[PDB]
Structure formats: C-alpha cells, structure tokens
C-alpha cells in the first residue's frame, strides 16, 4: 500500500493571499514512464470534485490559472496563486501509480 | 513554443505567379492537416486548401484549377503556388493546423498579398 | 476440489511404506506423486494411478481405488526421507496434495 | 452548409450579459468552434465543440446549444472583450465559417 | 457529458444491491471507469475501475471476491455487483471516467469527470 | 529440455515483476508449460499453465486478474507477468513441462522437467 500524509491538516487563509499544500507520498511515485502519478483533487463544500492537477504539476481542462503544482519523487505541494471566496473546500491527493488507490485525509482552505 | 512564420506574398500583376512559405516550430507539418485561410479586406474568414496528413490534397470551388498546396519534410515548411491570379485573390492568408472535432489550434500571423 | 495426506508417516529404514491421499470420487481421476527431497525441486515418481515412469525403480507402487489414492514403498531406505506430494487433475484445474512427510529412522 | 451569425453589430457596456448567437441552417450538433479576434489579429478558440472550455480561455466565456441551435454567452464583459466574433463549421469539407460579429465596448 | 448514477437505498445487512452508472454526452466506448467510495465524513476511497471493454476487472481487498463489476457497452451504463454488505461499505458512491483513452493513462489513475452519487445505508 | 528461470527480486506490495524460464533445446515447442510456486515454509501451489500451442491458458482461483503467462516457442522462453505482487506472493517459482499438448491431455501426464527456482519476495 501506498499511504500518502498531507501537510497541514487545515489551512484556513484570507482571501487574496497565496496558499501551498504538501502532501508526501510514502514510496516513489515517479517514473512510471516518465511523469510523477500524483493527482490534485478540490472537493467543494456539498458538491463532487474534479480534477485540479495531474501529472504532480500539470492541470486539466478549464482549472484556474492560480493553481499548480510542483515536487518530484515524495514531496509533492499545489501552489495557489491567489486564495479567493470560491476557493473553500477540502484538497485531495491520489497516487495514481499501483492498483490501490488511495486519497488524502482532506486539508480544507477556508476564509477565516 | 508553437508558432508559424509566413512569407511570400506581395504585390503581383493580375495572373501572375506567386508562391507563399509557412515555416512551423514545434508540430511537424508532414504529418499533420494543414490548412490555407483567406481574409480579403473588409471581409472575414474563408477556406482555401487543406493537405492531409497522408498527403492528400484539398481546395475550394473558387480554388480549383489556380492553387497548388505544397510541402517540404527537410525544413518543416507548407507552401501554396499561387497562380492566375485575378483581382479576387487579393487578400491576407493565414495557415492553421486542422484537428478536426478539435478547432484551428495555432495560426500564422498573416501575409497580405495584393493584385494590381 | 481438495486432496488430503497425512501431516507425515515413518517408518524404520528396510520396511514397507504407505502413505494414502484421499479425495471426493477420487477413484475416478488419475492422480500423480512426486518426490520432494529437502533442498530439491520435486520429481514424478508415479502417474496414471498405476504406471511409473523410466528411471525409477519398482519399489515405487502406487494404486488408486474409490475415494483414496495409495503410494506403497517396499524397502524403504535413507533417501526416501523425503516429501511426497498427491496430484490430481480436476476440471483443468492443477490441485496439489498435502504432501506427507515420510522419515526414515 | 451556410452558417447566419446573429446580430452582426453588437454594443454593450462593462458587466453586461451577452448572446451571441450563430445559427446552424441544418443541424449539426456538435461541430462548433468560437473564434474571437482582436481587430487586425490572430483568431483564438473560445469554446471548441460547442460547450467546452478551450485551455487557457479565461472561465467567463460559456458557450451552449446543440443541434439546430447555438449561442456564445458571456458572463460579465470587460473592456478589452471587443473582438469580432467568428463560428466554424468543424468536421467538415469547406470549413464554413459565419460572417462575423463585431462586440464593441460601448 | 453526464454521470446518472442509480439505484441505492436503504439495504440489508448481508443482504444486496446493483448500481448504475448511466453514462452519455462522450465516447465511454474507449474510456475507463472508477468507482469511489466516501463513507460519512471519512474521505474519498477506492473500490473498483474497467477497461475500455471489460474483462479488466480490478478491485480492493475489501471488496475481493464481494464485489464485481460490469458494464454495457452497447447502452453505455456502468454495472456493479454487491454481496454480503457488511457496515463498512455504508457510503455515496461516486463513477468516475480516467481523463483519456490511450496507454499509460492508468485504468486505475487520473479521474476526470465524477457524478452526483447515490447514498447506500446498509442498516435496519 | 534444460530450463532456467530468472526475474527474481525485492519489490513492494503491489509492484510489478516479469519472471521467465528459458530452455536450451527445441523441444520446449512440445511441452506445456505450468508456474508452480514453492512457499518458503510449506510445499508447492499450482500458479497457471499454458499449452504447447499457447492457446489454452489456465490460472489458479487466487491469481487470475493479476498475472498473465506467455510463451514463445520460436523464442525457446516462457513467461509470467506478475502484476499485483501481493502479501502472500513471495516464494520461489517452478516452471514445469507438463508433455501434453493440449489442456485435455495434461491429466495423462505430469510435471517432469523443473528448472532451478528463482526467489520472488514482496515486504515493505
């Protein structure tokens, strides 16, 4: 099993200011051909999620231009440009590397 | 990172000869779709000639019999012979790379050619 | 579909070994024994519940009736010490035995 | 095929809800392509087959419709959103496209 | 595109149930499937996915053996078996499609779309 | 036929490996071939099988879905990719011929020519 642990457990921050989660995987995640299988989920408050970032630094169709992600081989971080009011809600990583697919605990970015 | 170059346009007499350059960075014209676009002044968009990926040809109603699209696998490149050429030709020509359900990712900034 | 043998059987070194594997309608399947001397990959010994294949002496005598398969070694000696594995082939299914260990004193 | 963009002169203030709407004569249903370009510029795409948001297109530009019908919408304008507006016929033999509106921040 | 997952209810222990994903607006022809679980407050958890035309049928150990999935692709629906429900697998239940449709887009990795999902209580 | 195995080695609950046992003769294009893996405290466990054609493949109940057994007859070597690599995977393998060509004759046979072991061991 890969269990993956996120850092910190809860990031409440002000709108306007920037906001990184971390979240590192137990084994190596790199290389399965040449990327890093590490994905980003948001779970809105109430709503289903969808992708945020695949690949570790890369994102999918239509995602905000404030997110993106960087680290390579365990350490991992999502790097939001600019916290606003439609961005609470609990993030989510996933190794997308063995069968077992396990997500994070959940790590909410709130306005406090 | 991808980006066309164009070149080869000009003023030319009615009926002349003529030939355009689309240079490409990036995607590999020889196995691609691509297409040549016309803009004459004070008009909008229109469709000229499309050369498939295979090396099959493409030309419109208004081209037929005129035009020749042409490529080059050494440099990259997409031309169009450009041949008797009446007062109607005289336009701004763009090439656009054609993915089908998938729209004109990348264009070319533009050549204006000129009948006179 | 499960074949059972004995944990391990013994006997003294010169007498007659018996060492039986049971099965549901075993009778009516053919079944294969295999030696597996410690350290050793395992080789055939017995197959087709009566037939034994070229390199092995006669001693080995295996028999197959109702509900239990019987492999019988008159003579044991020193290196019969080893484990001893029923096979059975059902519905193209490989299901091996227990494997009785045998000891020879 | 002929594509009929609707209306071809456009005017709205910063904020505005806008439709702009090309009519398909026939009925394809999936073959759109918005093309916004900057007065004597480079076209972009907007919404490729129709509803889906081409990357890197900012989240305020929505386009809908299927079938005989389709319409770009724009949720609050901003005053560089003058361009003028072209649709595409995509999966086709001639590329027909419509014949342009003109969105002035007015 | 739109993920219309059915059935679930209130349902036995140890007893069973069937869900749906009732897929359209894309191919689901060449695209893979997911299915994740959440139980109340608990987090999102991985249960099962398919290839493009079955026979790739991947589960947890939770779910060995207990859980089987299918799908149609003539319809376009998404299938799941369920037996012997313990307590454990009281949860929303989300399908989801893999982002893509070649090779080394792990039938078991990135998860593009999701639904709605459907809430199956085991209780009495 | 003389056979060798290889593969063999440390991974991680879940990984990959490929095993493989190659023979020195020709003949190998005559036997079929099965996967027999030896616990490190107990005897042996039947893996899977393959006909001499290729074409008649079989796997244990506790095993289908994760390998998948593949010969070459031109290339005198066979094969078992070994996906899932689970807890109770790690052994030592033995290929073994079986003679009969088909799955319907392998009961008038058995297993005689086993090659030396190779060591497969899956632990955190």
């Known amino acids: 099993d890969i269990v993956m642990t996120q850092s910190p457990l809860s990031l409440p921050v002000t709108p306007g200011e920037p906001a990184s989660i971390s979240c590192r995987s137990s084994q190596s995640l790199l290389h399965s051909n040449g990327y890093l299988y590490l994905d980003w989920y948001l779970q809105k408050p109430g709503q289903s999620p969808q992708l945020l970032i695949y690949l570790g630094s890369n994102r999918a169709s239509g995602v905000p231009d404030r997110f993106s992600g960087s680290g390579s081989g365990t350490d991992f971080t999502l790097k939001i440009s600019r916290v606003e009011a439609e961005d609470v809600g609990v993030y989510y990583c996933m190794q997308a590397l063995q069968t077992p697919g396990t997500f994070g605990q959940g790590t909410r970015l709130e306005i406090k | 990172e991808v980006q066309l170059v164009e070149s080869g346009g000009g003023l030319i007499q009615p009926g002349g000869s003529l030939r355009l350059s689309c240079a490409a960075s990036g995607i590999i014209v020889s196995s691609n779709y691509m297409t040549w676009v016309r803009q004459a002044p004070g008009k909008g968009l229109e469709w000229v000639s499309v050369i498939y990926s295979g090396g099959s040809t493409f030309y419109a109603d208004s081209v037929k019999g005129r035009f020749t699209i042409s490529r080059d696998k050494s440099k990259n490149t997409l031309y169009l012979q450009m041949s008797s050429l009446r007062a109607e030709d005289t336009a701004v020509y763009y090439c656009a790379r054609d993915l089908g359900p998938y729209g004109m990712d990348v264009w070319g900034q533009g050549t204006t050619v000129t009948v006179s | 579909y499960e074949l059972t043998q004995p944990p391990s059987v013994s006997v003294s070194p010169g007498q007659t070994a018996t060492i039986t594997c049971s099965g549901d309608?075993?009778?009516?399947?053919?079944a294969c024994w295999y030696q597996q001397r410690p350290g050793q990959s395992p080789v055939l010994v017995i197959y087709?519940?009566?037939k034994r294949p070229s390199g092995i002496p006669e001693r080995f005598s295996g028999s197959n009736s109702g509900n239990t398969a019987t492999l019988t070694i008159g003579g044991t000696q020193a290196m019969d010490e080893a484990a001893y594995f029923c096979?059975?082939?059902?519905?193209?299914?490989?299901?091996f035995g227990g494997g009785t260990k045998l000891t020879v004193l | 095929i002929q594509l009929t963009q609707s209306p071809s002169f456009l005017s709205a203030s910063v904020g505005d809800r806008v439709t702009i709407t090309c009519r398909a004569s026939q009925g394809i249903s999936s073959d759109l392509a918005w093309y916004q370009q900057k007065p004597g510029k480079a076209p972009n795409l907007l919404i490729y087959a129709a509803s889906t948001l081409q990357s890197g297109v900012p989240s305020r530009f929505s386009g809908s419709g299927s079938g005989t019908d389709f319409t770009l919408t724009i949720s609050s304008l901003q005053p560089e959103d003058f361009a003028t507006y072209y649709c595409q016929q995509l999966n086709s033999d001639l590329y027909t496209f419509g014949q342009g509106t003109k969105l002035e921040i007015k | 595109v739109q993920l219309l997952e059915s059935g679930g209810g209130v349902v036995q222990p140890g007893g069973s149930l069937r869900l749906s994903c009732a897929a359209s607006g894309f191919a689901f022809t060449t695209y893979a499937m997911n299915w994740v679980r959440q139980a109340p407050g608990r987090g999102l958890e991985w249960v099962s996915a398919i290839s493009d035309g079955g026979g790739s049928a991947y589960y947890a150990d939770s779910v060995k053996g207990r859980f089987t999935i299918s799908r149609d692709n003539s319809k376009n629906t998404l299938y799941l078996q369920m037996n012997s429900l313990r307590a454990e697998d009281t949860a929303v239940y989300y399908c989801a499609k893999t982002r893509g449709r070649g090779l080394y887009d792990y039938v078991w990795g990135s998860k593009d779309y999701w639904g709605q999902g459907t809430l199956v209580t085991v209780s009495s | 036929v003389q056979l060798v195995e290889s593969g063999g080695g440390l991974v991680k609950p879940g990984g990959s490996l490929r095993l493989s046992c190659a023979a020195s003769?020709?003949?190998?294009?005559?036997?079929?071939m099965n996967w027999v893996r030896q616990a490190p405290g107990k005897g042996l466990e039947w893996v899977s099988s393959?006909?001499?054609?290729?074409?008649?493949?079989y796997y244990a109940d506790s095993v289908k879905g994760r390998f998948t057994i593949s010969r070459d007859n031109a290339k005198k070597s066979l094969y078992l990719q070994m996906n899932s690599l689970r807890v109770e995977d790690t052994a030592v393998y033995y290929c073994?011929?079986?003679?009969?060509?088909?799955?319907?004759?392998?009961?008038?046979?058995?297993?005689?020519?086993w090659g030396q072991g190779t060591t497969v061991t899956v632990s955190s």
């Open positions: 073994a011929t079986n003679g009969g060509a088909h799955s319907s004759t392998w009961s008038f046979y058995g297993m005689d020519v």
């Open positions: 003769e020709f003949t190998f294009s005559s036997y079929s």
């Open positions: 393959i006909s001499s054609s290729g074409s008649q493949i």
């Open positions: 309608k075993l009778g009516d399947k053919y």
């Open positions: 087709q519940d009566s």
């Open positions: 096979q059975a082939w059902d519905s193209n299914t490989g299901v």
